[PDB]
Amino acid sequence: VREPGSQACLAIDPLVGEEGGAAVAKLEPHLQPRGQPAPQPLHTLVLA
Amino acid sequence: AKKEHVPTWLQNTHVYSWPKNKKNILLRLLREEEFVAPPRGPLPTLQVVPL
């Protein structure tokens, strides 16, 4: 008989870098609000 | 409007509802992705432990 002492099997486990991983970022455009005095289209009429 | 009113060939892309998706429309016009993925890191180093 032989003993597995020296030849024992190996388990594996990755060295995950999640602890130092950057996050996913969401973008939102800062709308030029119409609540603030934004301009409007100058629909014109004629006084005949 | 409704989904049926979109011409068939246009249904193969993003369809924006207004004014529901005006922010998404602005992002599309700006040609900027709404979600920015972080850079692809390196493949994790692999550790072996005996049993």
Side-chain angles (χ1 to χ4, degrees), chain A residues 8-17 22-29 31, chain B residues 22-23 26-27 30 33-38 44-51:
Chain A
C9 301
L10 299 170
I12 300 185
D13 182 2
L15 298 181
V16 302
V24 156
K26 179 198 178 187
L27 275 60
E28 296 184 18
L31 312 179
Chain B
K22 57 189 178 183
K23 283 185 173 180
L26 275 185
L27 284 169
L30 295 160
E33 296 78 352
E34 180 171 13
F35 295 79
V36 176
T45 300
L46 200 52
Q47 181 181 18
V48 309
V49 183
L51 293 177

Side-chain angles (χ1 to χ4, degrees), chain A residues 23-44:
Chain A
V24 156
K26 179 198 178 187
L27 275 60
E28 296 184 18
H30 189 55
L31 312 179
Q32 289 292 335
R34 175 143 174 164
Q36 271 62 10
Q40 303 179 230
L42 314 178
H43 161 259
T44 297

